[model samples]
Target: EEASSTGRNFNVEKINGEWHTIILASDKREKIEDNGNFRLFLEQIHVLEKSLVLKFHTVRDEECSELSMVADKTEKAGEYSVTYDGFNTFTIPKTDYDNFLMAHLINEKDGETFQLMGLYGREPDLSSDIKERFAQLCEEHGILRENIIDLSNANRC
Candidate 1:
């Protein structure tokens, strides 16, 4: 198959009878992992598109690493908002990023905390309840819920 010039390519292929989705990984540069902020390089060539959920699962003891790109960064009063393309990577203050991932209150004293323990497991299972809870949290955060892929509810590849 032809690769995308953008360096990011996706495929929905039919094998036997069912369709599968794939996200190809780029070539790896081994020396990059020598840095403190570096996470393991991408070695696989697929993304879980089965349930339409764009989930990110990490190694059992893996710590979050720097993202390669960030679409925008914003700050207001004492709070910060950093938006990433999701496909690319970038780094934020560890505290802020951790709060975002765990669905903790981004603010120090307002809003309900949407604990998202299951979503970050070594193998995250995006259950129906998880999806719904995440959507609600997105709403609370003023994030466009439709922009998120709900793997459990979306058409599988």
Candidate 2:
């Protein structure tokens, strides 16, 4: 697929297949081992359409990388509210761009934490340009990129 001019693009219509969910990695001893106890609060996996969508609360109990909460996309743009603890569903310019964002979030951190999370899909290695764009978003949002220790831990809500 060709690159999109905007940073928001994705196959919103492709999420119609069965999806298997999983929580990626952890640093704490309790969460270190693979414990099949992640909870699915809300979500919808449409694999036939190659689309995964869900919202779940990121909590300390599920380690810092809890990816079990499922969420549905209520708003296609602007700020998104999912359940009580789902991360904002951002709208990428295209499907490729959307995949790029997902990949970046799943990639191993170069520092203290070096584990993966989520069973939705594999993280896509983004190109320099794409990375830069995501960086810009962080800069604008005041979000610390390397500080992705806990999604539910953040004091945004």
Candidate 3:
């Protein structure tokens, strides 16, 4: 099957930097629940020869830790694949150089499928306008507002 709508006509290197996690949403609440596995903060993104490497810091056991993941470039731009934890894919549906970006994550494990949405930005806090837009974006992706979690207050690494 095809992936989500990805960005077009944009250089991938411009998005590389120490980013911050703004919003994390999922169709299923448990995916972004307290201390959930998907509640990770984006720190850095590296553009490799044929892949994208991401660095994230996640809080667990009262300790903040770093996790690195690599997504090999796929046949199309803006979409990549990662193995393990039962199969997964990473797609950047939207990205704006020097400002904000969105990542759509999918994982299929144990015969079950899950989708998560992430908003990352260069600045720590985003304006109400963009916040509202993100809410609408989640809804457009069929994720209920109740499943949206705003982490702008304090999702520090």
Candidate 4:
């Protein structure tokens, strides 16, 4: 399949600061299921010279574990390359910098592909409107409403 792009006029400067992953969706159920690599509890972000630093936590061994990784900027704005559990192309398909943002990830692990989506916002919880907005974006990108999960009240470290 051909690579795709999003995040119009993507600004790297404005993405630095604390963030919260309010919701997540994926093409594969396991990608966003319990303990899934993509079931991330986002913590914060820091913009670099030409890349991004992302921090998040996950459930491991019935406990909370923190993780950090860098996403190298691509030639195109708002797009990045990340490697951890898999080699991934990370795209910021939508964001308002101050309020809410949407992240799309295409990951390849063991020669298999996975797609993950994230809706992050300034607050630990978000409004119905923003949540619905993310839902629409998911629909446009091949995700179904059934796959969306709200994590507004998830336990974190």
Q: Which digits, one per residue and each the tens of the lDDT, describe model 2 over residues 46-154?
A: 3222224453333355454434433333333322233322233333332342333221121122233222222232231334564555445444444444522222122
| Candidate 3 global lDDT | 0.79
Model 1 regions lying over 4 Å from their true place: 1-119, 151-157
**Cα lDDT for residue 126, candidate 3:** 75
Report, for every candidate in turn, its global Cα lDDT versus the true structure: 0.24, 0.32, 0.79, 0.84
The predicted structure with the larger lDDT, 1 or 2, is: 2
What are the models' TM-scores?
Answer: 0.25, 0.35, 0.89, 0.91
- The clash tally of candidate 1 reads 7
- Regions more than 4 Å wrong, model 4: 1-8
Model 1: weakest 10-residue lDDT segment is: 15-24
Candidates in descending lDDT order: 4, 3, 2, 1
lDDT of 3 by residue, 29-141 (tens): 88677768778888888887788788888887668998898878878677788874668887777666667777788888889998888888888877777777778878888
lDDT of 4 by residue, 49-70 (tens): 9778999889877788888999
Residue 42 of model 2 has an lDDT of 19
Q: Put the candidates in TM-score order, highest first.
A: 4, 3, 2, 1
What overall lDDT, based on C-alpha atoms, would model 1 receive against the true structure?
Answer: 0.24
Provide the lDDT at 44 for model 3. 83
Best of the candidates, lDDT: 4
